[PDB]
Design an enzyme around this catalytic site. Structure first.
Site, PDB file in Angstrom:
ATOM      1  CG  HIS A  40      48.497  30.541  29.186  1.00  0.00           C
ATOM      2  ND1 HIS A  40      49.226  31.561  29.777  1.00  0.00           N
ATOM      3  CD2 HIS A  40      47.810  29.941  30.193  1.00  0.00           C
ATOM      4  CE1 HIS A  40      48.951  31.605  31.065  1.00  0.00           C
ATOM      5  NE2 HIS A  40      48.081  30.648  31.339  1.00  0.00           N
ATOM      6  CD  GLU A  52      31.921  40.478  38.061  1.00  0.00           C
ATOM      7  OE1 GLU A  52      31.561  40.778  39.225  1.00  0.00           O
ATOM      8  OE2 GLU A  52      31.297  39.672  37.330  1.00  0.00           O
ATOM      9  CG  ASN A  54      31.164  38.206  45.397  1.00  0.00           C
ATOM     10  OD1 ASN A  54      31.222  37.274  44.609  1.00  0.00           O
ATOM     11  ND2 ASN A  54      30.775  38.065  46.679  1.00  0.00           N
ATOM     12  CB  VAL A  57      27.372  38.323  44.584  1.00  0.00           C
ATOM     13  CG1 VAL A  57      26.186  39.223  44.985  1.00  0.00           C
ATOM     14  CG2 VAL A  57      27.380  37.082  45.432  1.00  0.00           C
ATOM     15  CD  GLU A  62      28.215  42.970  38.974  1.00  0.00           C
ATOM     16  OE1 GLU A  62      27.305  43.837  38.902  1.00  0.00           O
ATOM     17  OE2 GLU A  62      28.430  42.236  39.948  1.00  0.00           O
ATOM     18  CG  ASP A  84      51.157  33.597  27.626  1.00  0.00           C
ATOM     19  OD1 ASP A  84      50.135  33.496  26.908  1.00  0.00           O
ATOM     20  OD2 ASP A  84      51.218  33.170  28.814  1.00  0.00           O
ATOM     21  N   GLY A 178      46.765  35.914  32.563  1.00  0.00           N
ATOM     22  CA  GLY A 178      46.240  36.917  31.674  1.00  0.00           C
ATOM     23  C   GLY A 178      46.005  38.250  32.332  1.00  0.00           C
TER      24      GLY A 178
HETATM   25 CA    CA Z   1      29.883  40.612  40.724  1.00  0.00          CA
END
Ligand code: CA
Length: 223
Positions: A40, A52, A54, A57, A62, A84, A178
């Site tokens: 979905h 990740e 935050n 930012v 990342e 699903d 998810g």
């Molecule tokens: Ca970040």
């Protein structure tokens, strides 16, 4: 995540954010090239954001990797939410380290009472809406199939489990969809649906991942 706490940075290293301009869903990294999420959450173009904490930012860990394949279960039903489950293949492999790491598929379904960790950047309020910048975490137990069906008469298929608390106050919510339910180092659930969020006798409903491990291996092998 309602009623949770802010995870320590990169302490849930298999958690990903699916982004199409902004964060819209979670997912879980199961090998260096593949993410499990909810059907979905499907969009025709998705950027997977790994490492990740935050999401607003840049912090230096990342990885932003485009989905090269976005594959939903062929018999997903958008009304019942049966099946699903979605698989994403990354356009390049994730670099694995202490902050970006894979989680295992389940060896067996989780027994009622098993303690899990649910995580995400979804709504943190049981009424109204507020969205966090920092990843949220919630410890919660698998509930019995009988309790799940009592809470949601006629709505629980064999591909769904309930996890959380009947009392109300602690649950996943929109935007967590998810994302992972991990118990004893195994991805047992995918955030799927529920009546509201964190309401009494309306626990979260999650895709029962153990029913799909064969479909996952076949799909990977064909792609
Ligand atoms: Ca970040």
């Amino acid at each position: 995540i309602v009623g949770g706490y802010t995870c320590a940075a990169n302490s849930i290293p298999y958690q990903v954010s699916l982004n199409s301009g902004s964060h819209f869903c979670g997912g879980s990294l199961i090998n260096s090239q593949w993410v499990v999420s909810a059907a979905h959450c499907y969009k025709s173009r998705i950027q997977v954001r790994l490492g990740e904490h935050n999401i607003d930012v840049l912090e230096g860990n990342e990885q932003f990797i485009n989905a090269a394949k976005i594959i939903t279960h062929p018999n997903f039903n958008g009304n019942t939410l049966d099946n699903d489950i979605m698989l994403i293949k990354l356009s390049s492999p994730a670099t694995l380290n202490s902050r970006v790491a894979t989680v295992s598929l389940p060896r067996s379904c989780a027994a009622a009472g098993t303690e899990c960790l649910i995580s995400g950047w979804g709504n943190t309020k049981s009424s109204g809406s507020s969205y966090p910048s920092l990843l949220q975490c919630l410890k919660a137990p698998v509930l019995s199939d009988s309790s799940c069906k009592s809470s949601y008469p006629g709505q629980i298929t064999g591909n769904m489990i309930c996890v959380g608390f009947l009392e109300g106050g602690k649950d996943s919510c929109q935007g967590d969809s998810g994302g992972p339910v991990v118990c004893n180092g195994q991805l047992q659930g995918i955030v799927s649906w529920g009546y509201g969020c964190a309401q009494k006798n309306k626990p979260g409903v999650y895709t029962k991942v153990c029913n799909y491990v064969n479909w996952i291996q076949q799909t990977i092998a064909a792609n």
